Amino acid sequence: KDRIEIFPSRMAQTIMKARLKGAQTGRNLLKKKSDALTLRFRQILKKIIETKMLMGEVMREAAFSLAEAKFTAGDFSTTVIQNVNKAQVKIRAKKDNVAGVTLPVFEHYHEQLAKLKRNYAKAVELLVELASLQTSFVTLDEAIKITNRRVNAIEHVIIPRIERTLAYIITELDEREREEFYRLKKIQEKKKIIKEKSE
Amino acid sequence: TMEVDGKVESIMKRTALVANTSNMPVAAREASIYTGITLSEYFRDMGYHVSMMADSTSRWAEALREISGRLAEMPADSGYPAYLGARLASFYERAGRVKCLGNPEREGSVSIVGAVSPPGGDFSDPVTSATLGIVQVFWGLDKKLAQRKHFPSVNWLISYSKYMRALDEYYDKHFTEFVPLRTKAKEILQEEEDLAEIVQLVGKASLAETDKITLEVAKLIKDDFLQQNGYTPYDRFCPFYKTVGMLSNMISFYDMARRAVETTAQSDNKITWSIIREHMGEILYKLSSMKFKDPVKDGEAKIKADYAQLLEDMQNAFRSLE
Amino acid sequence: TMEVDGKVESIMKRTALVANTSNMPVAAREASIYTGITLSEYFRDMGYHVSMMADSTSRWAEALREISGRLAEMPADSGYPAYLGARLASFYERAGRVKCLGNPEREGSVSIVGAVSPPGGDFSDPVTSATLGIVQVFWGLDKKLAQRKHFPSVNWLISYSKYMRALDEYYDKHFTEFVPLRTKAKEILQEEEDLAEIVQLVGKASLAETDKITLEVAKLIKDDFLQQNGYTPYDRFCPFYKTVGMLSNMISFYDMARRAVETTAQSDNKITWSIIREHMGEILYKLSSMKFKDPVKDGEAKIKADYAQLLEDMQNAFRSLE
Amino acid sequence: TMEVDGKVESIMKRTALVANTSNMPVAAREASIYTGITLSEYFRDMGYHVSMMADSTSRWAEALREISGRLAEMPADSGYPAYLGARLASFYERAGRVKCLGNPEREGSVSIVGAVSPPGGDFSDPVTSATLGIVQVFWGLDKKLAQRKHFPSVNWLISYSKYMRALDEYYDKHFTEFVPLRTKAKEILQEEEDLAEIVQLVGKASLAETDKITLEVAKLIKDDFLQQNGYTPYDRFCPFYKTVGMLSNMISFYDMARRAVETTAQSDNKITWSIIREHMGEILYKLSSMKFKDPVKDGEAKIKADYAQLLEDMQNAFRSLE
Amino acid sequence: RGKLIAVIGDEDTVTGFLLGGIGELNKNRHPNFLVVEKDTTINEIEDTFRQFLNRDDIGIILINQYIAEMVRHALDAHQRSIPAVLEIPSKEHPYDAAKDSILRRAKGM
Amino acid sequence: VCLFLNLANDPTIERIITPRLALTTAEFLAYQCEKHVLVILTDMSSYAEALREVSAAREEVPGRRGFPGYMYTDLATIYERAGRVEGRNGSITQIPILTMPNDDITHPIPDLTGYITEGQIYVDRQLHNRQIYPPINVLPSLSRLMKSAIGEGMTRKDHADVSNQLYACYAIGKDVQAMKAVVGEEALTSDDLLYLEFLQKFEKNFITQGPYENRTVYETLDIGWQLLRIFPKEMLKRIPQSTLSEFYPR
Amino acid sequence: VCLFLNLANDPTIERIITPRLALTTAEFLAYQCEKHVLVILTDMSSYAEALREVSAAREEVPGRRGFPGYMYTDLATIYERAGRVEGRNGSITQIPILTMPNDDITHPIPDLTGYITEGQIYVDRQLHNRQIYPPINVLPSLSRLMKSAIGEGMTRKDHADVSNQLYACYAIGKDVQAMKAVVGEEALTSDDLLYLEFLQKFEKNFITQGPYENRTVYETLDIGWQLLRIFPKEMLKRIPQSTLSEFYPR
Numbered sequence A: 001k002d003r004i005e006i007f008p009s010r011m012a013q014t015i016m017k018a019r020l021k022g023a024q025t026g027r028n029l030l031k032k033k034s035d036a037l038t039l040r041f042r043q044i045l046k047k048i049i050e051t052k053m054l055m056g057e058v059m060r061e062a063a064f065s066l067a068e069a070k071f072t073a074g075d076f077s078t079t080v081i082q083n084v085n086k087a088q089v090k091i092r093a094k095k096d097n098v099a100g101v102t103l104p105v106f107e108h109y110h111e112q113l114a115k116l117k118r119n120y121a122k123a124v125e126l127l128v129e130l131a132s133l134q135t136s137f138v139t140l141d142e143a144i145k146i147t148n149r150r151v152n153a154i155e156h157v158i159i160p161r162i163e164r165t166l167a168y169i170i171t172e173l174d175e176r177e178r179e180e181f182y183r184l185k186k187i188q189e190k191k192k193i194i195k196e197k198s199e
Numbered sequence B, C, D: 001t002m003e004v005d006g007k008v009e010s011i012m013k014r015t016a017l018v019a020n021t022s023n024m025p026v027a028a029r030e031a032s033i034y035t036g037i038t039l040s041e042y043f044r045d046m047g048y049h050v051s052m053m054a055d056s057t058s059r060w061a062e063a064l065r066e067i068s069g070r071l072a073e074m075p076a077d078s079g080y081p082a083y084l085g086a087r088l089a090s091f092y093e094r095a096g097r098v099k100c101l102g103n104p105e106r107e108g109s110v111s112i113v114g115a116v117s118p119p120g121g122d123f124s125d126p127v128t129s130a131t132l133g134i135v136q137v138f139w140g141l142d143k144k145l146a147q148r149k150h151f152p153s154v155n156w157l158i159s160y161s162k163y164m165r166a167l168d169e170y171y172d173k174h175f176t177e178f179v180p181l182r183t184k185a186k187e188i189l190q191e192e193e194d195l196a197e198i199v200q201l202v203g204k205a206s207l208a209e210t211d212k213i214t215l216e217v218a219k220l221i222k223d224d225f226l227q228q229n230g231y232t233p234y235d236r237f238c239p240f241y242k243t244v245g246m247l248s249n250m251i252s253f254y255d256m257a258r259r260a261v262e263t264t265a266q267s268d269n270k271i272t273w274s275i276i277r278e279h280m281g282e283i284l285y286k287l288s289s290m291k292f293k294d295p296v297k298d299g300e301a302k303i304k305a306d307y308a309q310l311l312e313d314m315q316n317a318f319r320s321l322e
Numbered sequence E: 001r002g003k004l005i006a007v008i009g010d011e012d013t014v015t016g017f018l019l020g021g022i023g024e025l026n027k028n029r030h031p032n033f034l035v036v037e038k039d040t041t042i043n044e045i046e047d048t049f050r051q052f053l054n055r056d057d058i059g060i061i062l063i064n065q066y067i068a069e070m071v072r073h074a075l076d077a078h079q080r081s082i083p084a085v086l087e088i089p090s091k092e093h094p095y096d097a098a099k100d101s102i103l104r105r106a107k108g109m
Numbered sequence F, G: 001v002c003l004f005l006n007l008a009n010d011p012t013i014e015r016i017i018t019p020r021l022a023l024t025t026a027e028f029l030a031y032q033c034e035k036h037v038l039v040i041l042t043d044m045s046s047y048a049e050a051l052r053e054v055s056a057a058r059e060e061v062p063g064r065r066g067f068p069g070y071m072y073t074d075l076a077t078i079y080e081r082a083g084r085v086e087g088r089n090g091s092i093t094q095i096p097i098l099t100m101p102n103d104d105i106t107h108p109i110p111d112l113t114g115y116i117t118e119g120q121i122y123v124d125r126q127l128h129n130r131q132i133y134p135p136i137n138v139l140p141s142l143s144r145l146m147k148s149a150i151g152e153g154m155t156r157k158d159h160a161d162v163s164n165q166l167y168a169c170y171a172i173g174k175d176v177q178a179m180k181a182v183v184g185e186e187a188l189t190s191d192d193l194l195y196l197e198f199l200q201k202f203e204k205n206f207i208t209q210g211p212y213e214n215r216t217v218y219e220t221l222d223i224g225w226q227l228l229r230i231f232p233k234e235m236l237k238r239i240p241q242s243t244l245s246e247f248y249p250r
Ligand SMILES: Nc1ncnc2c1ncn2[C@@H]1O[C@H](COP(=O)(O)OP(=O)(O)O)[C@@H](O)[C@H]1O
Pocket: B151, B152, B228, B229, B230, B231, F115, F142, F143, F144, F145, F147
């Protein structure tokens, strides 16, 4: 609601000023975190576009090499598909760090036709980097959304609440001072009247 | 009009007004209050259960403050006289149910319902603070709910009534099924308050499904049970059979939705709030429109039968859903 | 010094100074505003147009609060007297244009440009609130723009003027085209302010060509129209004819660029702000250099003719490009 | 009882009590402080060092306020007499070290320790504000530490002592190495205060190794050097040799661990706080148990030798790590 | 223990990737690849794709652009990051930057 | 039109009698000459501040923010001189215009005026800055005699239901705006988008109005219905099904 | 030095007349003996307390926050006995010292002092706890008339540029510390590391001085240039190239 419901007082005013400053500092730090995450996110986005463009060439070259291979070796697709056995290239999970956010990434690891093998190995070398980039991209997107939500929540709910509480506390302390002034003025008037009575 | 022995008789035949409007002499306001209560006491001694509506005791307190200022008395909090609390307590103490005086054994009452008008809507007001230390029931009204036209604007969180334990004896024998419904409704509202405090900062993305059901049934209770348009033929008066039937239906829906969600959390066919809402749009609208039943145009028997039919529809729809 | 009749006189030949520091009698400080406005009214009644400038009405209000405290008067909002608003309103009500009393038909005026000091930039204190409620113009100088070296430092976003509807007649008589130019310039600046956030969210590359035109003409107005150096001999004083000419040329460039972009959106050879900049860097340079016309050496006729020639060149270039 | 010249003697033999309960007459409550300080001054003139404890100068200020109200004087802020500061100064400033009157040369002293207790721990309380302008030492209260049950609950961030400069001469002759230890301890505590805000606002993952050393050494110092349970046989009174030895060990560990982490930074065999903690959990445990040394049975020589052995173990373990 | 790579594409792309060394048969002999022949319909592609995502050791998933368009709804539903899905070109259909399930998250492109 | 003018430079204490004079005249024109008198008291903030000045001079017991302890009674003496009267065909309609200090609807002047008067028309700065005229924020506004001045007979029979539903949907739209400020566009459900569209079209088509445009009550109700038709019937929970079936489809 | 000592337990009316004695002596020495006087008035909060006591003795009602209503005039009377005068070669500079109660810059004493004076030098509790002496925070502090006190013939050509660049680099260093606290040391760029280094060496060499270390303003500027030579010439954007070409080298 509008106010924290701390009873007006100088101690309460000090507590609310401290809380407001702490909230502002936390908002600024989370905004810097969001800025770092967004910078890395846009860098990874540009890298993703560039890697997709480069794939546009690597995959095409590999496919044309496949056509050239089939020109000589014949219908080698059936044997290659049937003779699968065990994977010779595998993926190992790795961690990366951006601000406090952990990004998952991947490691490429090893467990005419020769040219085709080389070209598709190069294609896999490119696509593993692409997969790592896209995984980091999704993680950064989620983390950026969460942190922006935190910053917006702070600066649109918590800080206004504390500001309203501080304004109310200041007004109520002004009221206390006004009441004390009225009582003291009344006492002074009564003392003057009593002095006149004695005189 | 009200029906006595099958004959309609006006309610002005039992109402007595003691009017002292805002621009009428200030010093009279105090007298007004006193006159009011005395009249009430007079009709309490006959054996009648009088009810005294003090339209605004804040105005009486303000009149006392003006007269004190003219007397150059030393003020209490916010200018009010030092005897404001004593005056309010002595006025409110005249309310209790009594065994009237005199030889014929009787039993009267004077229910004092005293509206307070805190300046600036701040309940820290000396008049409001002094009143809450005397009155046993506190129907605190919220300005935000009024602005949304959520009338009656009673703030269900801060308001309280210290007569519930004294009334369970009567509820258990006349509305035996009502006390647990009331307890569950208050639990739902408190849980919704906590979940709203969380959601305002975090959003509904991370809410547990049962938390979503709590939020949605709490919204149902707020919009379609608590709030009651008092200027309509159906919601001007809500008999207690209606007040308990509507709550029974909403709490039954809450129970069934929670049962489904909890018992199908482990299964693959996870029932969530969205599935219920899509399947039970008609039933949810019927629960929302339960308030529109007319106590007079539609008899008590018809209203009770329709609520029972809505309960049957809810049961059948949930069974067909699970 | 000021140049009148071709001679450099001292502005003290026509100026008076009600100067007093903070250790002077509080009554001297509190009556400084009234002495100034009474001298200004005296010189208005003579048929002259006076311009009173209270250096900081906040200090006068502090003197008023001090006098109130000395008199032991009840403290109003945040310590100020019970009549601060009345005093400020009655002081500012003395400003205005009058048919001077007396036989020789005259007409004088007093323009009050009283400055105020908001605590820490907060316009919510009683003095600033009352002044902003009373006054009709607010020139909102900003330290932020001063640091950016944008002089004058009028923020041109929090500033405002409520005399536009009063000056509509004067503009339509003498400067017919000024009003639409000013409205378009203000809307351009507002659009630039709104697009500053979109630039953060998606960068500049994601902006449409119309948005790029808006940004790159808003920059032109900020840096080459609003920004003005008071030390240079050419634009220390900018006659209103020169100002309206510059704004006319800027808004003409904006409108014709927008027209080109919109009417080439349907073609495959769509125009872009980059295309327009590459083709008309010379025109943009001339727009930036319109400032450098000296009102004294380059008479009104010469400056108007040069601006008309500039407009002719923009029209030729846009016609060729389109 | 206390050990003097090898005998246990009652504390009453050198103590006097001026008992004044809260229900005793307010005038007596006002004169109690003066009687106490006069007795303290009398025994100071003898050549003794009298330590005086004023159980509450806040209750003294309440007595002054009540007597001022009874006298019908105009109060200062919060109802206290405007001469409260003068009275507090007249009381406190009677302390000090003095070359007592009288021919036989002697030097006495009166060390006043005035207890304050503002309403609800208010730091702006007029009595506390008047106190802080007079007293040279102020052992402020951490409500958070008190709630956590961290005793003594001194809040080391606003509590201060202005006698450090005067005590430099004593320390540089008796405890030569203590001043840099105190400086580094204060720096470490302030760094932890700055780092905890960030650790709780954002997260603990981004901390550098040196920040981890700072945080964990601050935890060590706070929990096992600034935390002293006064009910135990070993921690009822901590001799200053024990204090300085403990602080020397903690700061030596701090400096050497920071040296390790910094030197191995930008190097293949990097060292991190986790490595240090895992390697020498025994060293950390011994530093933690350093507070358990009991001067009564573990003589000064024994405690000093044990702390030197701990330093030797620390150096050996870091040499092995390096 | 390490993750694998999965392929959903034409016989030629599958053959090239296998020559790259991506395929293997698990303990149940299940494969980590599919050849989208004309005899295979949309439901089969969606089912095998779902199997690939639910499997915890898959890691990367590669899908041809046109195939990804065919089962686009499943691609969009999949929102978690670890099962990295990549859309790759083909001789049958070219690759285009637009309408990629991952690039939906970017407006600065 | 009869004008009583007490400008800024005119005596301050005289403002304490400027309303009464006017009201007295209105009373004569209404309860003796049987006119229908619209009384407009401009800057009741100035009258209240003059009253505060006099009370401070008299050192009378202050209320909140320094105003006299009887400011409610005095403002009631001013306001309560309105309404019709038995046997007399005249009336007095009061529309005091008062400036809320610092836009604080809880300030003693607006607060006591709302306590006394039979409603209030709340002019909003947020709407004005957006250049919405009239910048009337209906949410904090109120009319206590609307419940009986509308319905079947006078105006139309859907007036009350349409007004209540517009209030509910406007409040929910403002709540959705508040939540969207935090959670962003993408987290809003379709119902939240419906409410935001209703809020936009409500502030653009219902509140916004030409300074010389005289909409009949029926035109206002038609606009209200065209706005309410954004939602499905089931989302209009204030309006009973009987009214929805007859008025919604068109 | 002419030293006036009013101890805490000395009469408070003596406290009232102490600053007036001091400033009368300063006026005699400056405007009659023609020597540039510097008046250091310590703990104006204690003077305000004495003023409050005398006001209560007069039986005047407390003003804002318990202090006299005319405290602004009294503080102005004290402070404004300063400045250069026409036709006299002496002056009176003033350095009032205030104990901000509760560290509240809104308190009447510091508030009115800022209203009357022309700057502020902030002694920071954070720097004090970090054991830096003098713990003078340079970000919130300000000297309005610094520009009149520097430049060729007064201090040196490069004083203003060095001061501006030092302030800018200090602010950027604090910002970079805040950023490093969130991103981690590795994520920082080379310029961020340079800014952190400048911050550390600025608080260790410029601010940290020692009680008996007297630095001539030329020595202060030499230290400032030593700290500015951490960055390359290009990052010193607030120092005109005409000054960098002359003072940056070496
Ligand atoms: N039960 C209700 N049903 C419908 N409207 C209500 C109800 N209670 C209050 N209201 C509305 O609230 C407004 C204020 O009513 P009232 O109680 O007279 O004001 P106050 O709070 O000053 O006493 C009325 O205009 C009325 O329309």
